[PDB]
Amino acid sequence: MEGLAGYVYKAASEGKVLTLAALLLNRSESDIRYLLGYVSQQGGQRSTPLIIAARNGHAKVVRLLLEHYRVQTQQTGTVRFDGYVIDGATALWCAAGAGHFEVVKLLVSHGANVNHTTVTNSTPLRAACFDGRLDIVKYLVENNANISIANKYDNTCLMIAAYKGHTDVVRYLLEQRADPNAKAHCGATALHFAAEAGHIDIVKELIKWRAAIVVNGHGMTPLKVAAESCKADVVELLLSHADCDRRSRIEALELLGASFANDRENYDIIKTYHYLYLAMLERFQDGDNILEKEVLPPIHAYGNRTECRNPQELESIRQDRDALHMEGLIVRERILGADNIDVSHPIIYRGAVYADNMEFEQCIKLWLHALHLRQKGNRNTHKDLLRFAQVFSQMIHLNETVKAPDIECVLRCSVLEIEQSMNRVKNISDADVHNAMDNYECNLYTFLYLVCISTKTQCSEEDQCKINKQIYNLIHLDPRTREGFTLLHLAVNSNTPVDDFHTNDVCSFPNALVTKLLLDCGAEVNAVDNEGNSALHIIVQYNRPISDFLTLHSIIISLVEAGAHTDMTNKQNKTPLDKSTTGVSEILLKTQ
Amino acid sequence: LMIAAYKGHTDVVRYLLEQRADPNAKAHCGATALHFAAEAGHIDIVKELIKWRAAIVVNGHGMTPLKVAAESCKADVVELLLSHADCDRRSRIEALELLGASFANDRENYDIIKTYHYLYLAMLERFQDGDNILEKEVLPPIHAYGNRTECRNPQEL
Amino acid sequence: MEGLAGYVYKAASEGKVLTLAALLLNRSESDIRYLLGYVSQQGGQRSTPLIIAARNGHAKVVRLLLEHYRVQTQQTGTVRFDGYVIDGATALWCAAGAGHFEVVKLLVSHGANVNHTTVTNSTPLRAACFDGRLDIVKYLVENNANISIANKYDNTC
Amino acid sequence: VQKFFLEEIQLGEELLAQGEYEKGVDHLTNAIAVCGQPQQLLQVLQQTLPPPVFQMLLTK
Amino acid sequence: DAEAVQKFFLEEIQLGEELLAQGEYEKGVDHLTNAIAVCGQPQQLLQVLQQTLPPPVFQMLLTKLPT
Amino acid sequence: LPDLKDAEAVQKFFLEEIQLGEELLAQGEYEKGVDHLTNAIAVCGQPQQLLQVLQQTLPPPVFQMLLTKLPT
């Protein structure tokens, strides 16, 4: 029964209570039992029609369904909503997961699982805490739900409530005998999450409970995780608790100001200079047994000057925001290390401003440190490498030449990132294997974008020899796509997507220049795809022989010189001339 | 119809062909609703009328839309006209001749290497068949253009 | 300096953009912010170029003031000119009381203060209720400012 | 028709569920008996409305 | 003065609309409060005032109309 | 054009040239508004920074119409 199940679902999804009465009654009980039990394709999920009605809070509709035939309240089904796609829990959890108190107060008296788990062991208390709906949160603890339901990431519902600015939901769990000391899988507490967004009122409740205050699993004290944020009220609040030692309380304001100008959503140098100067005034306030910054030389990538020392020294560099942004970023470079993600974030923002301010020379130099920092952190740079080639394409339009050592350093680290990205597919098995399949593949595209713009731009001979090494590195890696393509086949195919930025103007796939650079380093010209077509077969399948024949004429002679088999066949036994569909390429194939 | 085809308003062009308006309403100047589309490389506009049976016909001067598309150095819609209706191999070879002619002799498009490769494609296809061979008509050398006698062989080109 | 502050305040009050754009042209951020920090009393009421731009209704002026210029929502201005003229006004509060939904949603997307309390601790939510503009209240509720912020007389929105 | 009666027992009181109970309860009065289970549909329709409106639907 | 008001009424008719167009809704009505109720046809002005002004602006001028 | 004065018409006569265009922006004769605008940009002291400013002060038909007449 397909349509009848959907009509039963339609009776509860749209809230038409008369259809629900006419469906459960006026017919048999066994057939409707299968209909109201679950849905198959309705909503892209497999939940009971009462459950999807609880998602919309149809409290009156779900009340009538229980009167005729009591559906099992503990029955579960998929609910794809906020918090990623979820094989959702019971309807009481789903009503709590929908933030609808009208359905929660009915199932509890009717009989429901108070502490029912989800795929990520989510209790209905956490589901209400995820929505931050206080009256539902007040009700589950009145139903005596467990206050210590920690996630698979060791995130208790109180810590889940601490993600947002729920100053009332967080304080209510504190009233319900729950101290905020349940650390996450990364050791994160409710203190750190409230300090991420500067929730001074939430921390004050946790201050009021007087339970404990400690660092997370990253070794970051709650003032430090607020220091990398842009809200000094938390560090000010912890100053009342006297947990701010004078070394940490000064570098906090040093970090607090810098993030308040080194953010896309937070860019104000006036408080940034004020916080840095007041901290350095406090840094110089110690007088005897003075404490100072661990001095860091300027990065070959980021900037050309080291950090300031005198409190008034940073006042003179306030006029040029480039100097003070760097000065505020060195002090968080030394205290957070090269592996911190939150100190790598200002690196991308700075060059993006220079991209907006046409300082493409400073944009490329400084952005190399973000790739340098993320190499230390051993994380993906697929957004970083794409942003390099986008800005590389932008300055070609402005005709600002790149630095050949700069374009080599990004290329040298990209293949190391791709080697990590290829190993990332090896490192993961079932968590995000399709994401990892799409992770290394898009990284190869960025390298293809980076190499293509490198060929277009001027490059020194000593760097160009090292530039071809990364291409020589990847052609030895031989990355095989989902369809069996390789790096050579990626440039050969004209169906290769190009980034929406000016990289369309610098990538001309099928790109002869990239392919010519690919052929000298050992391209697999006779390699076959999933359909068995060689590099000669893919290039002849192009349907535009007139638009870019210069790319075609270069690749007809040269790829044949690499060893392309004119008599090669596909998995469907297709020859290059047989699968041509282009007279110009086939005649070129006949000549070659 | 041709006014939107004169511009890049491809949404108006693809809509108006469905409004029971023929693509063959030809102006006396010679525009067959694709001649006015053959100036800015309107690959999206021409694809609509090629689908809509554009009915290729020469202008008032006698130049084909394939030639007029080659007049604006727009190789994108040249292939559309070549792939539409009759192949007409005699014009197919000269389409490469005409398009390559301007790439070394146009201010907006000064590409010397593209002139050879288009002519080489013309020279390849002119003698590709072997028998029933066609050759360029031997116009007399013109003193303005030196004393050259065209390219009847791929070796001299 | 003060005369230039009056000039930029009148330009923001009127609604022209290039006038104060040229008035701030070739200037550092110090005097630019000072001109934008003209919180001086006009008509007996404290007002600011950002505030009077939000009070105006021109979403373009405030979209330039938040993006290309450095001004902050923490500001002092009128909240109700007829009989109240109470200070401590957020630009979002001024826009909500005036009723310009485009300026309200633009300031919300910018990140303006949604839970501000004046000396009479009045929220922009109750100003939107006072104006009766449904979409402003809907946007504010979707952005989850509050619902139970009352006046000093415990006067709910 | 019995199928139309089922449609009447399913869409006759569409205004009643939408708020306009004047034209819905009156229309569902005949539609409750027109269904194959008149007593069951009338009790369910009374249960579909409030207990204060259960008597109004039943006496309609 | 009242004959000069017949031209002075046209001044707020000219000048006062920019004050509403700029965004001074209250001040524009306040500037137009001095204007209205001196012309020979207030009703003929009223039937277009229902739609010349924005719907919130006109009803606020209705409050200022007898003032 | 005011002969590209060093410091007199860079800010004084410059303001009215947009103001003539800004009125003609409010009038609706944008082609006349562009004319008064495009003389101001030519006589502006630092007009390259105003490319981002002037690309959104306009109705969308004038976004490219002023840009085409910007070198003029």
CB nearest A584 (choices: B76, B113, B121): B121
Q: Cβ distance A534 to A568 under 8 Å?
A: yes
Who's near F8: CB < 8 A, 6+ residues apart?
F2
| Beta-strand relationship, A79-80 and A85-86 | antiparallel
Who's near A350: CB < 8 A, 6+ residues apart?
A262, A325, A326, A329, A366, A367
Q: Answer whether C1 touches F (CB < 8 Å).
A: no
**What's the Rg (C-alpha) of chain C?**
15
User: CA E26, CA C83: separation in Å to the nearest integer?
Assistant: 13
- Coil, helix or strand for A571? coil
User: CA A344, CA D35: separation in Å to the nearest integer?
Assistant: 69
Q: Cβ distance C70 to A268 under 8 Å?
A: yes
Q: Answer whether C16 touches F (CB < 8 Å).
A: yes
Count of Cβ atoms closer than 10 Å to residue D60 Cβ: 18
Output the six-digit token pair for A495.
Answer: 């169906």
User: CA A408, CA A420: separation in Å to the nearest integer?
Assistant: 18
User: CA F45, CA A573: separation in Å to the nearest integer?
Assistant: 69
User: CA D48, CA D32: separation in Å to the nearest integer?
Assistant: 12
User: CA C139, CA C108: separation in Å to the nearest integer?
Assistant: 9
A14, A26, A65, A66: best to mutate for the D interface, most D CBs within 10 A:
A26
Those chains having 3 or more beta-carbon pairs within 8 angstroms of chain F are: C
Output the six-digit token pair for C140.
Answer: 């504010």
Output the six-digit token pair for B11.
Answer: 């949404």
List of chain B residues whose C-beta atoms are within 8 Å of the C-beta of residue A588: 124
B28 in a known ligand binding site: yes
* F and C adjacent (3 or more CB pairs under 8 angstroms): yes
Contact between A319 and C70 using a beta-carbon 8 Å cutoff: no
**What's the Rg (C-alpha) of chain A?**
31
How was this structure determined? It was done by cryo-EM
Who's near B45: CB < 8 A, 6+ residues apart?
B4, B5, B8, B10, B13, B14, B37
Contact between A545 and B75 using a beta-carbon 8 Å cutoff: no
Q: Answer whether C87 touches E (CB < 8 Å).
A: no
CA distance A245 to chain C (A): 31
- Dihedral sign for Cα F33, C55, C46, C49, please: negative
- Coil, helix or strand for C92? helix
User: Strands, E, within C9-154: which ranges?
Assistant: 41-42, 45-46
Give the residue on E whose Cα is nearest the Cα of C12.
E22
Output the six-digit token pair for A404.
Answer: 């050949």
User: CA A69, CA A30: separation in Å to the nearest integer?
Assistant: 10
Q: Cβ distance C99 to E56 under 8 Å?
A: yes
Can the peptide bond before residue A510 be classed as cis, meaning omega within 30 degrees of 0?
yes
List of chain A residues whose C-beta atoms are within 8 Å of the C-beta of residue D12: 18
List of chain A residues whose C-beta atoms are within 8 Å of the C-beta of residue C143: none
**Rounded to whole angstroms, what are the CA distances from C95 to C59, C130, C155, E23?**
10, 12, 21, 11
Q: Cβ distance A347 to A373 under 8 Å?
A: yes
User: CA B112, CA B102: separation in Å to the nearest integer?
Assistant: 9
- Coil, helix or strand for C41? strand
Those chains having 3 or more beta-carbon pairs within 8 angstroms of chain E are: C
Q: Answer whether D8 touches A (CB < 8 Å).
A: no
Is A565 buried (19+), middle (13-18) or exposed (0-12) by CB count in 10 A? Answer: middle
User: CA A227, CA A252: separation in Å to the nearest integer?
Assistant: 5
List of chain B residues whose C-beta atoms are within 8 Å of the C-beta of residue A547: 75-76, 79
Output the six-digit token pair for A55.
Answer: 């998602």
List of chain C residues whose C-beta atoms are within 8 Å of the C-beta of residue E59: none
Residue at token pair 């009591």: A70
D5, D30, D48, D49: best to mutate for the A interface, most A CBs within 10 A:
D48
Q: Cβ distance A24 to D43 under 8 Å?
A: no
HEC letters along A406-435: HHHHHHHHHHHHHHHHHHHHHHCCCCCHHH
Q: Which long-range contacts (CB under 8 A, 24 or more apart) does F8-11 make?
A: F9/F43, F10/F43, F10/F44, F10/F45, F11/C22, F11/C25, F11/F45
CA distance F15 to chain C (A): 7
List, in sequence order, the alpha helices (H) in F11-72.
Answer: 12-27, 30-43, 51-54, 60-68
Distance of CA C96 to the CA centre of its chain: 9
Q: Please, what is the end-to-end C-alpha distance for chain E in angstroms?
A: 20
Output the six-digit token pair for B41.
Answer: 């490389």
Report residue A90: phi and psi, to 5°.
-55, 165
- Coil, helix or strand for A182? coil
Nearest to A6 by CA among A36, A27, A50: A36
User: CA B15, CA B1: separation in Å to the nearest integer?
Assistant: 10
Output the six-digit token pair for E6.
Answer: 């017949």
Contact between D44 and A16 using a beta-carbon 8 Å cutoff: no
User: CA C118, CA C140: separation in Å to the nearest integer?
Assistant: 18
Who's near C78: CB < 8 A, 6+ residues apart?
C45, C46, C47, C51, C55, C84, C85, C86, C87, C89, C94
User: CA C142, CA C119: separation in Å to the nearest integer?
Assistant: 26
| Beta-strand relationship, A79-80 and C41-42 | unpaired
Residues in chain A: 592
Query: What DSSP element (H or E) covers A79?
Result: strand A79-80
List, in sequence order, the alpha helices (H) in A69-133.
Answer: 91-97, 101-110, 124-131
**Residues within 8 A of A (CB atoms), D 17-56 only:** 17, 28, 35-37, 40-41, 44-45, 47-48
A459 in a known ligand binding site: no
- Ramachandran quadrant class, A210 (left: phi over 0; alpha: psi -120 to 50; beta: rest): left
Question: Which residues in A have their CB inside 8 Å of a CB on C?
Answer: 265, 267-270, 319
Residue at token pair 């080639």: A389
Q: Cβ distance A143 to A172 under 8 Å?
A: no
Who's near A23: CB < 8 A, 6+ residues apart?
A7, A8, A11, A32, A35, D10
User: CA B29, CA B32: separation in Å to the nearest integer?
Assistant: 9
User: CA D58, CA D49: separation in Å to the nearest integer?
Assistant: 10
Give the residue on B whose Cα is nearest the Cα of A585.
B121
Query: What DSSP element (H or E) covers A85?
Result: strand A85-86
User: CA B109, CA E40: separation in Å to the nearest integer?
Assistant: 71
User: CA B91, CA B64: separation in Å to the nearest integer?
Assistant: 9
User: CA C1, CA A562: separation in Å to the nearest integer?
Assistant: 73
User: CA F51, CA F32: separation in Å to the nearest integer?
Assistant: 19
A199 in a known ligand binding site: no
- Coil, helix or strand for A80? strand
Nearest to A554 by CA among A507, A516, A522: A516
List of chain C residues whose C-beta atoms are within 8 Å of the C-beta of residue F50: 21
Output the six-digit token pair for B104.
Answer: 């070394």
Q: Answer whether F57 touches C (CB < 8 Å).
A: yes
Nearest to F11 by CA among C18, C117, A217, A78: C18
HEC letters along chain B: CHHHHHCCCHHHHHHHCCCCCCCCCCCCCCCCCCCCCCCCCCHHHHHHHHHCCCCCCCCCCCCCHHHHHHHCCCHHHHHHHHCCCCCCHHHHHHHHHHHHHHHCCCCCCCCHHHHHHHHHHHHHHHCCCCCCCCCCCCCCCCCCCCCCCCCCCCCCC
User: CA A409, CA B102: separation in Å to the nearest integer?
Assistant: 42
Angle at A341 between CA A339 and CA A347, to 5 degrees: 100
C4, C18, C32: best to mutate for the F interface, most F CBs within 10 A:
C18
Output the six-digit token pair for A417.
Answer: 């990132």
- Torsion, Cα A261 A263 A267 A271, to 10 degrees, reads -40
Query: Which amino acid type is present at position C12?
Result: A
